[PDB]
Amino acid sequence: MRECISIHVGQAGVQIGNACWELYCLEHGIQPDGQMPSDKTIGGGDDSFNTFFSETGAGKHVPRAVFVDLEPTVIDEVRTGTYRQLFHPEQLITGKEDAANNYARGHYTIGKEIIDLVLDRIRKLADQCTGLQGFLVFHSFGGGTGSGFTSLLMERLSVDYGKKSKLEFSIYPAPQVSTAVVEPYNSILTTHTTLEHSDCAFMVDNEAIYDICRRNLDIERPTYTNLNRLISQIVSSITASLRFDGALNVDLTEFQTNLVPYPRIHFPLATYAPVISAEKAYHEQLSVAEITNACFEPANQMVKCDPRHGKYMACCLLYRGDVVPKDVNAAIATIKTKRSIQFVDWCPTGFKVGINYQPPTVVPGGDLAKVQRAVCMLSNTTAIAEAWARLDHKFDLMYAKRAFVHWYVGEGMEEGEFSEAREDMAALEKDYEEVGVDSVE
């Protein structure tokens, strides 16, 4: 059984998961009290709730997910909220003080106190698995728990397990919008485990999502609640071919084999094409051809980036619903035709399609309309180096005067560790300079 583990770390990581685990409840037809209603005398792990829901006896569905925070407060929104009996009580693990936007606290001081209780929750879910697929860590670069704790966990998960996929859904720091002033300190130090221990790190940021809500979608005034329904459709499609039938299904490992060229070049941005408001959903031509072109739009990116500034290295089409493939292959051949889209010269064969039959669900009270087709495009590009150049420069400014150093050293790390994680990220950005360039003879 294609089972998978969600881990939701820190405030952002929890609050996304609300929007994730809201959705799968609708995907598989599960009430917030974990119950499938009486109109499901059909196949359950044939609808495959069984990758995200261990079926407790007597028709009751509880996730394979763990909600971890060093602060009591965030998860207590999940107790009560409405999800107060969706969740297993013992998978909502609270500390007492958060890391408090301090990586040294989340990794050394506070994080170690709950790390074995969290790893022991993993084992209770790891031993219930048959054919474990991997882990889905949600967090934000630029928290304390999202960076400090996640770094501590990913070390421990690499040692105990090794073999499985470990996906990350990070939130990257936005170039203008920031709310912590040590936001770059906590991102340089999370660099270390993100490239080493994760197998595939995704990056999103809030500004590139603000664009999409306002422009494609005509929402006046987004909150976090609005953005995360969007986030969840990207992840919901990723992991949909594990757990629904379709031609050209794609396991969690078939991404990495088809998306990731080299060891540490594993930072693909996602997109999602049918972001359409209810009114604008008529006056649609929302065919396969239009929605494939919309993925390659530099405006429909989930990262403050412009793929016109770098070259794609792989793409990866994950479609849901009313789909005929030859429409897709004719839309690929258009994509290969255009010269505004630069692939690299060592790719040649562009990219991997995958289709699934299960159409998305419209989240109730949600921002999308009812679409028939839908497409994430996970896509390696050399344009995500530009996100890094804009953030190293913020780190290099503050660390030039050794600003907030006294908070960090007095918590269980060294001054020396800044100089290693800065070199570490400077080498990544040098890898993408050398991976964009073809070789000639």
């Binding site: 405030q11 602060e71 009591p72 407060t73 965030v74 207590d76 929104e77 007492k96 003080e97 958060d98 408090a100 936007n101 301090n102 203008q176 919008v177 920031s178 709310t179 912590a180 002033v181 040590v182 936001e183 770059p184 809030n206 603000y210 306002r214 005034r221 987004p222 909150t223 976090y224 913020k394 400014l397 503050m398 030039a400 005067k401 600003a403 907030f404 006294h406 908070w407």
Partner: protein, 429 residues
């Protein structure tokens, strides 16, 4: 979890906190008697941040009232909110402080601090997981300055890792009502440097200026100016008590407000401030609130930010608001005024957003600024200090009480060195 011990000290300390626990006691629907009369269960989830629940749903604060004079205590007891405190927390001597620093820090303070730290340990031994402390006091008083800094310098020996912050009132030369308030303020600035995690510098002139210009009051008393200040102190720890979209404890501010140690002197700010009548004529929004927070005339510190650069600010909003408008307004500011910000720090602003506004309006906000323009405070005092001290005026009331000269000269130099700490961090790239 995350309890706050309140040590209101001196005369001024007690007046503010009197009005402070009239606001908090409204935030959580506490009766004057001490019963609960709310409706929403948000008011109780985090009541324990300030209040010990006692037997039979009465709610006793965790506040300790310190004085060297029986008077303020008898006033508070006999008032509307006497009932609310525990009577073992009204700790007071008999002989007055003299508005003398030496008398409150060495002679008559040391005698009493034993009977007060024993009350600190009643409170600290009852908490689940303490976060922090707080003085409310006055740089320019006897007990506010002297006894306050004796309490502080004896808590760092006991509780060396809790966020200890002060809401300290600082003197202004335009409004003087004590002759030796330079002597009393110099010798306590010396103690606040090495001992405190955050310091919210508040003045008097800055509070009339809010009353006259913004609020359109006529005739302000201490009663009115501290009613403002208490609306700031409520704002600080809102996300500690209420759920929010961004949270922010005491520690969260501290961490990214304070570049270097020692530079922990903040300038608060509140918005909105309207007169009654002129409330149906302001539309209440986020661009409306942001423009007041970057206004000079809504600083509770009698300075103009334009005489320096904000190192860092924090913006604590309270209300059902958006995040784009917040993230944008806080962006459009540090672009249009990029010469008013220190440029070696990207994103000088930290936002926090609670969900719970004050109990009369929607969408308040609270500005807390680490500006370099606060050396304007420290120099206006160290000019009065050095003008009296060159004559050695009023000296025998100080050397009489256990002090000597060398405590002065060093304390003058510790104030004049941190003028050269705001100065370094204003200019030089």
């Amino acid at each position: 979890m995350r309890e706050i011990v309140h040590i209101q000290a001196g005369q001024c300390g007690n007046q503010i906190g009197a009005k402070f626990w009239e606001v908090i006691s409204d935030e959580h629907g506490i009766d004057p008697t001490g019963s609960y009369h709310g409706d929403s269960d948000l008011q109780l989830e985090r009541i324990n941040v300030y209040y010990n629940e006692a037997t039979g749903n009465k709610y006793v604060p965790r506040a300790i009232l310190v004085d060297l004079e029986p008077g303020t205590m008898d006033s508070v007891r006999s008032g509307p909110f006497g009932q609310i405190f525990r009577p073992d927390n009204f700790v007071f001597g008999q002989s007055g402080a003299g508005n003398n620093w030496a008398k409150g820090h060495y002679t008559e303070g040391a005698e009493l601090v034993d009977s007060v730290l024993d009350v600190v340990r009643k409170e600290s031994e009852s908490c689940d997981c303490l976060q922090g402390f707080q003085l409310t006091h006055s740089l320019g008083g006897g007990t506010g300055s002297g006894m306050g800094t004796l309490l502080i310098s004896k808590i760092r020996e006991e509780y060396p890792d809790r966020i200890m912050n002060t809401f300290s009132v600082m003197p202004s030369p335009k409004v003087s009502d004590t002759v030796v308030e330079p002597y009393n303020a110099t010798l306590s600035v010396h103690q606040l440097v090495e001992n405190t995690d955050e310091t919210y510098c508040i003045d008097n002139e800055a509070l009339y200026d809010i009353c006259f210009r913004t609020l359109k009051l006529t005739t302000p008393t201490y009663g009115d100016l501290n009613h403002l200040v208490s609306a700031t102190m409520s704002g600080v720890t809102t996300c500690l008590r209420f759920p929010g979209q961004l949270n922010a404890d005491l520690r969260k501010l501290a961490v990214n407000m304070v570049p270097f140690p020692r530079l922990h002197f903040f300038m608060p700010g509140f918005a909105p401030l309207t007169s009654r009548g002129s409330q149906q004529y302001r539309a209440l929004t986020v661009p409306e609130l942001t423009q007041q927070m970057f206004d000079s005339k809504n600083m509770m510190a009698a300075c103009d930010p334009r005489h320096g650069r904000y190192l860092t600010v924090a913006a604590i909003f309270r209300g059902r608001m958006s995040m784009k408008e917040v993230d944008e307004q806080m962006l459009n500011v540090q672009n249009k005024n990029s010469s008013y910000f220190v440029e070696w720090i990207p994103n000088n602003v930290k936002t926090a957003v609670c969900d719970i506004p004050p109990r009369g309006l929607k969408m308040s906000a609270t500005f807390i600024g680490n500006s370099t323009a606060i050396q304007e405070l420290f120099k206006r005092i160290s000019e009065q200090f050095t003008a009296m001290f060159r004559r050695k005026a009023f000296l025998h009331w100080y050397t009489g009480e256990g002090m000597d000269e060398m405590e002065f000269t060093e304390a003058e130099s510790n104030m004049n060195d941190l003028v050269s700490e705001y100065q370094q961090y204003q200019d030089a790239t």
